[PDB]
Subunit: 493 residues, 4 copies
């Protein structure tokens, strides 16, 4: 019903007064300094992502410190996300450093570890010990970004596969491999992940972007690797292959949210199907009320060019129409030449998409899916958003200590900002991956526990006033739903 | 309610047994031969587009001839579209054939025809005589694809504008200019267009893609130039700038359909805003029941590379999700290295997208916008589509001689194939720009007037059976639509 | 959604141009002559009911002949209904002709046939041989219209019940008894019913109003008693006690329609619950697409008074709002003093109720109950009525030989007349108990089988024109659905 | 969607645990004593109606006193309604105390006051001075309950009408007349009404039933007569003729509620049309959120017989189905032989009807009629009722001091009891004419101002528990409604 809303739109009308989508930026050499991080924050960054595929603990500690210093100097709360290297399948070494794979040739891939430093075009090592059990004759094995496609012909022996080379390509040492028709059964967390997750907990990161999640039991393995001290850290599962996509329901249920990793998906799945897998995964997350991030190949050509291509811009806008909470930048900010400009243009595109998005379709689709009787929390949050639309209120205020009720209200997609007043700074940071929400910290130690809620309500309404969301005479819908509840339709003074 | 439908999808399920979206291909050096046109047709081309920006009438005649021969040998009907050159604003010549424009510098643009062969970085000619009346201080004037941006400071005299150069560039001879802040008031059709359009009428083209349409009155000018022998030829308006967007409602009402020229709109409008105008223009056409084409910058990187980028793939898929009837290839087929593969890949993307699209949302959205009381045609066609969803029928058969009622059924977006049985070959060709329809030609000379309609009905049901759309025991909804009639047929 | 339609109404606006509800009249001494029957027909009678509780075969043959003669002289098709006496429970005789039952007294009720002509206040016979098996201690036994209420205390023996007399009342010979908390298991058809049903078949009656229907198997017993020659006669089941009401779904499924006998129901059930049983039974019949008649105590005081009471008039109007196809008159026309006036006032009240009834609520409630996928017939009839509302058509034409598709269209309640063109006179008569339908007979023997349907369509449209329903420029929705189908939206010429 | 709800009902299921509809009883000789008033209260009376057509102020004073004592001894709050005499048209006296009017005969009706004590079948007085201006040839003039119908032929002179007698009747002294074709322009309130209304204010009545209301302006006259000390007293307009019906919308907007006087409307309007006006007037009030009473000819035959007729029972049930807040007894309780049994039986019929009524239809019908944007009160109350249906809550508790928000919640028709907690006894009494609400008095002197609201909330939840409406683990929706607040309470 976007369709009827399209007919009423004008591209010459003003954009909204708030941007709902959130921007995650990956930190690297273009962006790690305190000053650069301040430029990012002012450009629209809400979340700093550390890519633990590269870089030492000392290197990531510097990001951690610089982010916190940059956010304190600007007076804001910025989330810190640890993105794990994850389990990997790699080839071994080749003799002469290199190996020249010709089309039509026969080669032998083995998991015999004797071969890790003496592969040749004839026979080389792949380091995934279960390779033979997981693959069958006819299956494909991809190497080097999926560029070299070997096809499996037979089991030469219990550790070695006879392969055909289907296309020509020179491959150097230790390329990554994929297995598109194959259920890969590597552990959820490598030995390096286990050390790296323990470091995130010690340093108080807000969320883990957990690589290569294939099943619900693996989300529980990440959680157990975080330990009892990491219990409040959110686990965002990165969906990267057909197994993640097949098992998406049970993964969603166990996770705190989802990353749609379109570039990794596209190694094993046709790009046009990844487009559809994106729609599916975003809508399931919207229904679960959990944050979903659209990641990889976002404004990629703006890594070295001052503008993106028109198709890239349409890609970011459509992520927002699909329902994404968050859009993520990778090399565009980590190693690019226009980090501030790419964040600002991404914010711009998101704002323009939002101005055309009919939010009421989301609200009404999600509400129609609810079973009667609803539980109290789902009834209160849905009816508070419905009151926004019925009175044309201009803001909501949600008192939420853990963020749970702020996410439940954002799930129902009011067409106005949501201000979450919370007593925890970690909730302010974790809400940066939920669309349409801004957080206000209420220091209850100094200010009092505020049992009757009046002070936290007034702080929320003041914040909305100071941002111009509301003025004297507008309506503001207030809600509390503590996991006791209460809704109010407040006439702003 | 696309959202509820996304939840139940699996990308591992089979795709639909038909592709609804239609593919238009521009013919040029890579594709004009008879054998290359057969390749395009087999790859998924429904429409051959002739770009009259280039090529003589003899050249285009060879395209027309060769298309007809290719389609005849494959036993299919292919539409031929004549895409007009249109009005252009161009600069004149520079001295030395070049002009090095520099940031901060001052220059003078004049409409004094004295300067057409003798401009310089200092002062040159722009051939649009109304330049000064239409522009104002502050306005920008883009030249060379919008690369060179000049800002207008003042009227040096009644024909000359003093401009700042806002950024550097060299510009060679005769570049095209745009006026993003400006209501350009050039003629609808130029003398060359009138000449081309009459030639289109003589050669029997099925539709005009009319460039640079800015207002409703201008559609009438194209219709005039086509003359009384061109009255059955479709006019599709190309929307290429802000005036076209602003006046969209009155243009749609006069035209037979719309082309969204993303790349031309993008000269004066930010790219994120053109994404949104595309949504709007396509939805307005879906509601009007008129074809809409998404054109330019489709799978462009596939002109020279064997695969497009992932972002280009999503752009194609999202045109189909926005509601586009057609997607159009330009240089990918006119001059590219992989014309067959690009069309096959476009068809594959369209079919993947369609298999996710909830057609019921479009049907229900459009039905709710109908004014009660409805006129009989609207009532019959919308209720015939409603009957598809109520009975889970597996095809529709629509008897339509002019294709009018076939477009009317298609507008309501049934979730099954529509087979249109028509006695006019021109109708078979013109319905190639309507999504979701396949035409079956019923030869009324060779077979009779069939005024009981039975033979024509059997021919449509026989076509749907041969495609595997229906078998024994399926329902097929049959319609003829001022007399009309709907039957829900149990298939034998 | 009657509620929103009420707000728009004016009682000073004109009534509709057609009356949808149908009137059934019972024939007796006030009405049996040919001339009186003509007055009834002109007053609004569509169905002549013969009450076979009284009167000989010769007497009912006279009604049959006079009705047919009266309808032929007026050029119309009038249905003839045979209403069966049905099984009855009666007391025997008392000594001295009479017996004086006092409150507080003990009496004995026996099924010993020795006592049929020698009852006394002390002990008398009830002729239902299963009385003892069906009743238990605490149960009530009603006698004389329910006026004398005995309560069962114990089984004196296997054929005799010791009773308390709960209220005083003199009772004469052979009163009817009821058993309100009791499942009565008398046969569906008495020996007299069996002779009487055979007579209806020989004389070609159109429908049977089958008395005291308690279960689905009893509808099949009526059907079997009609025999193979009575297979096209409709069976309308009279619901008269709690068993009929409990088993109403399976009875509806087996019957051709329902009579709500409010006076008989009210002997054993509280009047306020009968009001609700009426709503229930009419709506189940509306959903089944089968005619339902609201019968007994309709304008009863107009039997001897020239006007009815205000509550009586509100009762007839509310039967029409509840959804009744038909309203029935009993003594008001059989033995009353104002037979023409009561029919005319009943037609008047029905017309006024209809003018306020929102038909679109019926259509939309019934359509929302349909399961997808619908069968073709249900899809065609529902979509033809929907087209009436979408185009504001002013009539429908349905070609129906058996009446089945005309009833299926009437079920969906268009807000315009329905003209059924049929090749059978018995269909014209049977459609007189379906609301909103008028029939036109098409004599296919003389006029041709009309394979392409054009002649039957034009006869239907001419009929609508001659009644003023449509004129040049209006829309008329035509439908055929033969148990092949076709719908057309015709511009009237 | 009452239809879908009928399909799932069984008359053998238990009835609801509360009765929503309210019963008003007219007090007279059968019922004025303290013990008889206790009987009515225990039988189901919520409102004592005083008919000021008869009885002196001393008489009515004894009704007021006795009602208060009866209610005090039973621990309940009962509303007291003052039903005004109103304007009347009457004939004058006849000679011999009688006048034998005969079919076809001619007679003269005059407003000449000379004839008030000396009329005859030939010429008599009608005391409405505007008779001649308001009537025209053809119009009918009813006299004696509409029994004697005269037709107006001509103006004999400016004060005298020549009439045909259209049917026979004798008519004794001082009968009342009606004018069905006629816009009667008598005063809103007579001098006697002004006197009665001031006495109502001094004695603290809760509401006025204002007779013969014909226009909005006339409601203001009643409000004037009540004066500034009577500003909190409800004015319920009695709609008794065609002008009242015609002007219904403007009367509702000025009044606090409506009484549908079926028997008075039936003097000039056919009975089948009064059935329909009743539907209309009740629906308009339900939408306005104002109480509506169905009055006259309710269970009339039960004045002298121990049971009513079946048609009377259905009339009572259908008033509740039409949406009536109240049903009203007149002579059945004022002078009848079975005042307790008639009220018990009315309550039983109302409870049977309610257990079949789909309350969701009313809620949804009224919600769909709301203009967006809604004002905050409307939004809170409709969403609080929505939350009842979404969570299957088993009671509502509404804190309301003036009863305004309690009437606003009741308007939306939740399918559970509403408990209103109020600090005003007058509010407890006035809510007796609103369906579905029970009031709990919170004594703010004896217990404090409770500005945290907690004690009042507990008192309402405690009341709902004591009635068996909620138990541990049920939900209760709590509302206060310009500050407001809704909580969905899990019951402890
Ligand atoms: K990583
Ligand atoms: K928006
Ligand atoms: K062109
Ligand atoms: K689809
Ligand atoms: K009978
Ligand atoms: K009506
Ligand atoms: K009175
Ligand atoms: K109920």
């Amino acid at each position: 019903s976007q369709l009827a809303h399209n007919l009423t739109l004008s591209i010459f009308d003003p954009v909204a007064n708030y941007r709902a989508a959130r921007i995650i930026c990956t930190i690297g050499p273009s962006t790690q300094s305190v000053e650069a991080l301040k430029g990012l924050i002012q450009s629209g960054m809400s979340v700093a992502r550390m890519n633990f595929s590269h870089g030492s603990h000392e290197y990531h500690q510097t990001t951690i410190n610089n982010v916190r210093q940059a956010a304190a100097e600007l007076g804001v709360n910025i989330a810190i996300a640890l993105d794990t290297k994850g389990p990997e399948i790699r080839t071994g070494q080749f003799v002469g450093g290199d190996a020249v794979m010709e089309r039509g040739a026969t080669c032998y891939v083995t998991t015999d570890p004797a071969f890790a430093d003496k592969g040749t075009k004839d026979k080389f090592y792949i380091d995934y010990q279960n390779l033979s059990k997981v693959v069958r004759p006819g299956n494909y094995i991809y190497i080097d970004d999926g560029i070299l496609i070997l096809q499996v012909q037979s089991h030469e022996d219990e550790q070695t596969l006879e392969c055909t080379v289907t296309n020509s390509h020179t491959i150097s040492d230790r390329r990554g491999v994929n297995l598109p028709g194959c259920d890969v059964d590597l552990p959820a967390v490598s030995a390096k992940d286990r050390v790296d997750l323990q470091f995130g907990v010690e340093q108080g990161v807000d969320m883990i972007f957990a690589s290569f999640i294939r099943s619900a039991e693996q989300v529980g393995d990440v959680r157990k690797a975080l330990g009892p001290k990491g219990r409040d850290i959110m686990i965002i599962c990165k969906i990267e292959n057909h197994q993640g996509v097949q098992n998406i329901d049970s993964i969603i249920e166990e996770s705190d949210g989802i990353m749609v990793a379109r570039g990794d998906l596209g190694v094993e799945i046709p790009a046009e199907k990844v487009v559809v897998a994106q729609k599916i995964l975003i809508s399931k997350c919207n229904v679960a009320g959990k944050p979903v991030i659209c990641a990889t190949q976002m404004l990629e050509s703006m890594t070295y060019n001052p503008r993106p291509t028109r198709a890239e811009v349409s890609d970011v806008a459509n992520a927002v129409f699909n329902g994404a909470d968050c859009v993520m930048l990778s090399g565009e900010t980590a190693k690019g030449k226009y980090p501030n400009e790419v964040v600002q243009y991404m914010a711009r595109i998101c704002l323009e998409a939002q101005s055309a998005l009919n939010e009421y379709v989301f609200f009404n689709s999600i509400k129609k899916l609810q079973h009667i009787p609803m539980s109290a929390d789902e009834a209160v949050c849905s009816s508070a958003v419905n009151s926004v639309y019925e009175t044309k209120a201009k803001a909501m205020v949600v008192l939420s200590n853990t963020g749970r009720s702020a996410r439940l209200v954002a799930k129902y997609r009011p067409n106005c900002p949501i201000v979450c007043v919370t007593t925890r700074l970690q909730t302010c940071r974790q809400l940066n991956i939920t669309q349409g929400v801004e957080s206000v910290f209420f220091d209850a130690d100094k200010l009092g526990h505020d049992e009757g809620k009046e002070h936290r309500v007034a702080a929320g309404v003041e914040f909305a006033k100071s941002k111009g969301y509301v003025q004297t005479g507008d309506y503001c819908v207030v809600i509390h739903a503590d996991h006791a509840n209460q809704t109010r339709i407040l006439l702003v003074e």
